[PDB]
mmCIF file of all heavy atoms in Angstrom:
data_model
loop_
_atom_site.group_PDB
_atom_site.id
_atom_site.type_symbol
_atom_site.label_atom_id
_atom_site.label_comp_id
_atom_site.label_asym_id
_atom_site.label_seq_id
_atom_site.Cartn_x
_atom_site.Cartn_y
_atom_site.Cartn_z
ATOM 1 N N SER A 1 0.812 -1.208 0.000
ATOM 2 C CA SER A 1 0.000 0.000 0.000
ATOM 3 C C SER A 1 0.855 1.272 0.000
ATOM 4 O O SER A 1 0.529 2.219 -0.728
ATOM 5 C CB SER A 1 -0.986 0.006 1.171
ATOM 6 O OG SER A 1 -0.327 -0.089 2.411
ATOM 7 N N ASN A 2 1.939 1.300 0.787
ATOM 8 C CA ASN A 2 2.836 2.473 0.820
ATOM 9 C C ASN A 2 3.241 2.772 -0.624
ATOM 10 O O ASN A 2 3.063 3.885 -1.122
ATOM 11 C CB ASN A 2 4.135 2.194 1.594
ATOM 12 C CG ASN A 2 3.913 1.862 3.061
ATOM 13 O OD1 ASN A 2 4.750 1.207 3.684
ATOM 14 N ND2 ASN A 2 2.806 2.327 3.625
ATOM 15 N N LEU A 3 3.789 1.751 -1.281
ATOM 16 C CA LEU A 3 4.253 1.849 -2.654
ATOM 17 C C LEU A 3 3.171 2.339 -3.588
ATOM 18 O O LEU A 3 3.435 3.178 -4.452
ATOM 19 C CB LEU A 3 4.753 0.495 -3.154
ATOM 20 C CG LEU A 3 5.249 0.502 -4.604
ATOM 21 C CD1 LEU A 3 6.525 1.328 -4.713
ATOM 22 C CD2 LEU A 3 5.515 -0.918 -5.060
ATOM 23 N N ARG A 4 1.961 1.808 -3.420
ATOM 24 C CA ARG A 4 0.830 2.192 -4.256
ATOM 25 C C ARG A 4 0.483 3.652 -3.983
ATOM 26 O O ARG A 4 0.389 4.452 -4.906
ATOM 27 C CB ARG A 4 -0.374 1.281 -3.966
ATOM 28 C CG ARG A 4 -1.516 1.375 -4.975
ATOM 29 C CD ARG A 4 -2.584 0.277 -4.743
ATOM 30 N NE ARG A 4 -2.008 -1.072 -4.758
ATOM 31 C CZ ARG A 4 -2.152 -1.967 -3.779
ATOM 32 N NH1 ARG A 4 -2.869 -1.673 -2.691
ATOM 33 N NH2 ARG A 4 -1.580 -3.163 -3.889
ATOM 34 N N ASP A 5 0.302 4.000 -2.716
ATOM 35 C CA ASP A 5 -0.022 5.377 -2.345
ATOM 36 C C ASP A 5 0.993 6.359 -2.907
ATOM 37 O O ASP A 5 0.622 7.403 -3.437
ATOM 38 C CB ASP A 5 -0.070 5.529 -0.822
ATOM 39 C CG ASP A 5 -1.378 5.050 -0.225
ATOM 40 O OD1 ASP A 5 -2.335 4.801 -0.990
ATOM 41 O OD2 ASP A 5 -1.454 4.929 1.019
ATOM 42 N N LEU A 6 2.275 6.020 -2.788
ATOM 43 C CA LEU A 6 3.356 6.876 -3.273
ATOM 44 C C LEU A 6 3.369 7.036 -4.782
ATOM 45 O O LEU A 6 3.534 8.148 -5.292
ATOM 46 C CB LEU A 6 4.715 6.340 -2.799
ATOM 47 C CG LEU A 6 4.944 6.467 -1.291
ATOM 48 C CD1 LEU A 6 6.372 6.074 -0.945
ATOM 49 C CD2 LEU A 6 4.668 7.900 -0.851
ATOM 50 N N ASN A 7 3.214 5.926 -5.498
ATOM 51 C CA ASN A 7 3.202 5.967 -6.955
ATOM 52 C C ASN A 7 2.064 6.841 -7.429
ATOM 53 O O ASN A 7 2.204 7.597 -8.383
ATOM 54 C CB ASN A 7 3.035 4.566 -7.550
ATOM 55 C CG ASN A 7 4.308 3.757 -7.507
ATOM 56 O OD1 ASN A 7 5.391 4.274 -7.767
ATOM 57 N ND2 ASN A 7 4.183 2.471 -7.194
ATOM 58 N N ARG A 8 0.931 6.736 -6.747
ATOM 59 C CA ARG A 8 -0.247 7.514 -7.097
ATOM 60 C C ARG A 8 -0.002 9.016 -6.928
ATOM 61 O O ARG A 8 -0.363 9.810 -7.795
ATOM 62 C CB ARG A 8 -1.425 7.070 -6.231
ATOM 63 C CG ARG A 8 -2.748 7.707 -6.598
ATOM 64 C CD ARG A 8 -3.838 7.297 -5.611
ATOM 65 N NE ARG A 8 -5.173 7.627 -6.110
ATOM 66 C CZ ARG A 8 -6.306 7.295 -5.496
ATOM 67 N NH1 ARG A 8 -6.271 6.624 -4.346
ATOM 68 N NH2 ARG A 8 -7.476 7.638 -6.026
ATOM 69 N N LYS A 9 0.617 9.406 -5.817
ATOM 70 C CA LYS A 9 0.892 10.819 -5.561
ATOM 71 C C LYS A 9 1.978 11.405 -6.456
ATOM 72 O O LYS A 9 1.952 12.591 -6.775
ATOM 73 C CB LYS A 9 1.278 11.031 -4.095
ATOM 74 C CG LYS A 9 0.127 10.845 -3.129
ATOM 75 C CD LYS A 9 0.564 11.069 -1.696
ATOM 76 C CE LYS A 9 -0.609 10.896 -0.740
ATOM 77 N NZ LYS A 9 -0.175 10.985 0.679
ATOM 78 N N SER A 10 2.935 10.575 -6.857
ATOM 79 C CA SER A 10 4.019 11.034 -7.711
ATOM 80 C C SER A 10 3.538 11.349 -9.131
ATOM 81 O O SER A 10 4.352 11.586 -10.024
ATOM 82 C CB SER A 10 5.132 9.986 -7.766
ATOM 83 O OG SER A 10 4.694 8.800 -8.400
ATOM 84 N N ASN A 11 2.221 11.347 -9.334
ATOM 85 C CA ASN A 11 1.639 11.654 -10.643
ATOM 86 C C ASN A 11 1.279 13.136 -10.734
ATOM 87 O O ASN A 11 1.463 13.759 -11.780
ATOM 88 C CB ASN A 11 0.394 10.797 -10.884
ATOM 89 C CG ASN A 11 0.722 9.322 -11.005
ATOM 90 O OD1 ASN A 11 -0.166 8.487 -11.187
ATOM 91 N ND2 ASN A 11 2.008 8.992 -10.905
ATOM 92 N N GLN A 12 0.772 13.694 -9.636
ATOM 93 C CA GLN A 12 0.400 15.112 -9.585
ATOM 94 C C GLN A 12 1.656 15.987 -9.672
ATOM 95 O O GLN A 12 1.573 17.220 -9.628
ATOM 96 C CB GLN A 12 -0.327 15.457 -8.268
ATOM 97 C CG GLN A 12 -1.645 14.726 -7.979
ATOM 98 C CD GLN A 12 -2.422 15.363 -6.810
ATOM 99 O OE1 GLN A 12 -1.844 16.060 -5.961
ATOM 100 N NE2 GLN A 12 -3.734 15.116 -6.763
ATOM 101 N N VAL A 13 2.817 15.346 -9.768
ATOM 102 C CA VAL A 13 4.085 16.058 -9.845
ATOM 103 C C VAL A 13 4.762 15.838 -11.191
ATOM 104 O O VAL A 13 5.024 14.707 -11.615
ATOM 105 C CB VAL A 13 5.032 15.634 -8.699
ATOM 106 C CG1 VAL A 13 4.946 14.134 -8.487
ATOM 107 C CG2 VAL A 13 6.465 16.040 -9.022
ATOM 108 N N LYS A 14 5.050 16.952 -11.850
ATOM 109 C CA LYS A 14 5.662 16.941 -13.163
ATOM 110 C C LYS A 14 7.102 16.438 -13.208
ATOM 111 O O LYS A 14 7.398 15.442 -13.868
ATOM 112 C CB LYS A 14 5.599 18.352 -13.757
ATOM 113 C CG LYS A 14 4.974 18.417 -15.137
ATOM 114 C CD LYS A 14 3.530 17.923 -15.125
ATOM 115 C CE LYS A 14 2.886 18.102 -16.498
ATOM 116 N NZ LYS A 14 2.862 19.543 -16.910
ATOM 117 N N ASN A 15 7.996 17.132 -12.516
ATOM 118 C CA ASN A 15 9.405 16.760 -12.534
ATOM 119 C C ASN A 15 9.833 15.738 -11.477
ATOM 120 O O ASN A 15 10.888 15.888 -10.850
ATOM 121 C CB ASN A 15 10.257 18.030 -12.421
ATOM 122 C CG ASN A 15 9.943 18.834 -11.166
ATOM 123 O OD1 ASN A 15 8.779 18.950 -10.759
ATOM 124 N ND2 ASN A 15 10.979 19.408 -10.553
ATOM 125 N N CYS A 16 9.028 14.693 -11.294
ATOM 126 C CA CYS A 16 9.344 13.652 -10.315
ATOM 127 C C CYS A 16 10.717 13.069 -10.639
ATOM 128 O O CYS A 16 10.995 12.740 -11.786
ATOM 129 C CB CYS A 16 8.286 12.551 -10.348
ATOM 130 S SG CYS A 16 8.618 11.190 -9.212
ATOM 131 N N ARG A 17 11.580 12.945 -9.639
ATOM 132 C CA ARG A 17 12.910 12.420 -9.893
ATOM 133 C C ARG A 17 13.354 11.386 -8.872
ATOM 134 O O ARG A 17 14.444 10.827 -8.983
ATOM 135 C CB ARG A 17 13.927 13.554 -9.900
ATOM 136 C CG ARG A 17 14.296 14.003 -8.511
ATOM 137 C CD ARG A 17 15.679 14.596 -8.497
ATOM 138 N NE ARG A 17 16.203 14.713 -7.144
ATOM 139 C CZ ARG A 17 17.426 15.151 -6.861
ATOM 140 N NH1 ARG A 17 18.253 15.518 -7.838
ATOM 141 N NH2 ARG A 17 17.832 15.215 -5.601
ATOM 142 N N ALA A 18 12.520 11.148 -7.869
ATOM 143 C CA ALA A 18 12.847 10.179 -6.840
ATOM 144 C C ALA A 18 12.564 8.761 -7.324
ATOM 145 O O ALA A 18 11.556 8.506 -7.984
ATOM 146 C CB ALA A 18 12.043 10.474 -5.583
ATOM 147 N N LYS A 19 13.470 7.841 -7.013
ATOM 148 C CA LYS A 19 13.288 6.443 -7.384
ATOM 149 C C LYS A 19 12.490 5.816 -6.240
ATOM 150 O O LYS A 19 13.030 5.560 -5.165
ATOM 151 C CB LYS A 19 14.635 5.727 -7.501
ATOM 152 C CG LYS A 19 15.627 6.329 -8.496
ATOM 153 C CD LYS A 19 16.200 7.650 -7.999
ATOM 154 C CE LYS A 19 17.363 8.153 -8.854
ATOM 155 N NZ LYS A 19 17.927 9.434 -8.317
ATOM 156 N N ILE A 20 11.203 5.587 -6.455
ATOM 157 C CA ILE A 20 10.373 5.000 -5.410
ATOM 158 C C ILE A 20 10.508 3.483 -5.406
ATOM 159 O O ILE A 20 10.224 2.827 -6.405
ATOM 160 C CB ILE A 20 8.905 5.389 -5.612
ATOM 161 C CG1 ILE A 20 8.807 6.912 -5.738
ATOM 162 C CG2 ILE A 20 8.074 4.884 -4.454
ATOM 163 C CD1 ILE A 20 7.407 7.430 -5.848
ATOM 164 N N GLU A 21 10.943 2.924 -4.281
ATOM 165 C CA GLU A 21 11.132 1.480 -4.193
ATOM 166 C C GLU A 21 10.804 0.893 -2.832
ATOM 167 O O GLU A 21 10.771 1.601 -1.822
ATOM 168 C CB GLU A 21 12.578 1.127 -4.535
ATOM 169 C CG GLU A 21 13.129 1.890 -5.723
ATOM 170 C CD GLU A 21 14.525 1.450 -6.119
ATOM 171 O OE1 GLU A 21 15.380 1.271 -5.226
ATOM 172 O OE2 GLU A 21 14.774 1.293 -7.337
ATOM 173 N N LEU A 22 10.553 -0.411 -2.821
ATOM 174 C CA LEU A 22 10.272 -1.141 -1.589
ATOM 175 C C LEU A 22 11.637 -1.415 -0.977
ATOM 176 O O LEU A 22 12.548 -1.874 -1.663
ATOM 177 C CB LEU A 22 9.564 -2.471 -1.885
ATOM 178 C CG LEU A 22 8.085 -2.441 -2.279
ATOM 179 C CD1 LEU A 22 7.689 -3.750 -2.957
ATOM 180 C CD2 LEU A 22 7.243 -2.203 -1.036
ATOM 181 N N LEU A 23 11.782 -1.116 0.307
ATOM 182 C CA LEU A 23 13.049 -1.337 0.989
ATOM 183 C C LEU A 23 13.437 -2.810 0.959
ATOM 184 O O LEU A 23 14.617 -3.150 0.862
ATOM 185 C CB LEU A 23 12.960 -0.860 2.439
ATOM 186 C CG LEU A 23 14.216 -1.048 3.278
ATOM 187 C CD1 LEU A 23 15.380 -0.342 2.596
ATOM 188 C CD2 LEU A 23 13.994 -0.487 4.666
ATOM 189 N N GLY A 24 12.436 -3.683 1.035
ATOM 190 C CA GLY A 24 12.698 -5.113 1.026
ATOM 191 C C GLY A 24 13.174 -5.677 -0.302
ATOM 192 O O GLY A 24 13.615 -6.826 -0.360
ATOM 193 N N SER A 25 13.085 -4.893 -1.376
ATOM 194 C CA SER A 25 13.534 -5.376 -2.680
ATOM 195 C C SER A 25 15.053 -5.555 -2.660
ATOM 196 O O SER A 25 15.629 -6.165 -3.562
ATOM 197 C CB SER A 25 13.132 -4.400 -3.790
ATOM 198 O OG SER A 25 13.804 -3.162 -3.647
ATOM 199 N N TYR A 26 15.692 -5.021 -1.622
ATOM 200 C CA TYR A 26 17.142 -5.127 -1.467
ATOM 201 C C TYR A 26 17.546 -6.271 -0.533
ATOM 202 O O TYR A 26 18.733 -6.577 -0.389
ATOM 203 C CB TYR A 26 17.722 -3.812 -0.928
ATOM 204 C CG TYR A 26 17.714 -2.675 -1.927
ATOM 205 C CD1 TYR A 26 16.604 -1.834 -2.065
ATOM 206 C CD2 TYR A 26 18.816 -2.454 -2.755
ATOM 207 C CE1 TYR A 26 16.599 -0.798 -3.002
ATOM 208 C CE2 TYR A 26 18.820 -1.427 -3.694
ATOM 209 C CZ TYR A 26 17.717 -0.602 -3.815
ATOM 210 O OH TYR A 26 17.744 0.420 -4.740
ATOM 211 N N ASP A 27 16.560 -6.898 0.098
ATOM 212 C CA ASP A 27 16.815 -7.995 1.021
ATOM 213 C C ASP A 27 17.310 -9.244 0.307
ATOM 214 O O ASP A 27 16.635 -9.768 -0.568
ATOM 215 C CB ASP A 27 15.537 -8.317 1.811
ATOM 216 C CG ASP A 27 15.702 -9.501 2.752
ATOM 217 O OD1 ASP A 27 16.851 -9.869 3.064
ATOM 218 O OD2 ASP A 27 14.675 -10.058 3.197
ATOM 219 N N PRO A 28 18.507 -9.731 0.671
ATOM 220 C CA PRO A 28 19.042 -10.939 0.033
ATOM 221 C C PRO A 28 18.186 -12.174 0.331
ATOM 222 O O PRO A 28 18.222 -13.153 -0.413
ATOM 223 C CB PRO A 28 20.455 -11.042 0.609
ATOM 224 C CG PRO A 28 20.344 -10.354 1.936
ATOM 225 C CD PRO A 28 19.488 -9.157 1.609
ATOM 226 N N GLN A 29 17.413 -12.117 1.414
ATOM 227 C CA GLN A 29 16.546 -13.225 1.798
ATOM 228 C C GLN A 29 15.161 -13.058 1.190
ATOM 229 O O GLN A 29 14.206 -13.747 1.574
ATOM 230 C CB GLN A 29 16.446 -13.301 3.319
ATOM 231 C CG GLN A 29 17.810 -13.523 3.972
ATOM 232 C CD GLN A 29 17.727 -13.666 5.487
ATOM 233 O OE1 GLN A 29 18.754 -13.826 6.144
ATOM 234 N NE2 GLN A 29 16.553 -13.614 6.084
ATOM 235 N N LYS A 30 15.129 -12.146 0.266
ATOM 236 C CA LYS A 30 13.945 -11.815 -0.510
ATOM 237 C C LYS A 30 12.657 -11.712 0.341
ATOM 238 O O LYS A 30 11.558 -12.034 -0.113
ATOM 239 C CB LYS A 30 13.714 -12.874 -1.603
ATOM 240 C CG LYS A 30 14.023 -12.360 -3.022
ATOM 241 C CD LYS A 30 15.526 -12.246 -3.317
ATOM 242 C CE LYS A 30 15.837 -11.728 -4.729
ATOM 243 N NZ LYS A 30 17.281 -11.585 -4.991
ATOM 244 N N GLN A 31 12.701 -11.274 1.604
ATOM 245 C CA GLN A 31 11.396 -11.042 2.265
ATOM 246 C C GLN A 31 11.033 -9.587 2.013
ATOM 247 O O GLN A 31 11.197 -8.727 2.889
ATOM 248 C CB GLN A 31 11.318 -11.294 3.764
ATOM 249 C CG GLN A 31 9.860 -11.474 4.214
ATOM 250 C CD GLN A 31 9.653 -11.390 5.726
ATOM 251 O OE1 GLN A 31 8.511 -11.388 6.189
ATOM 252 N NE2 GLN A 31 10.693 -11.331 6.532
#
């Protein structure tokens, strides 16, 4: 939901430049 909420809000912004990602996507144990 965080990710969804964020992606949705980053639309009302023209020059979006932040890389929005799930912190767990970096987990080697893939949780």
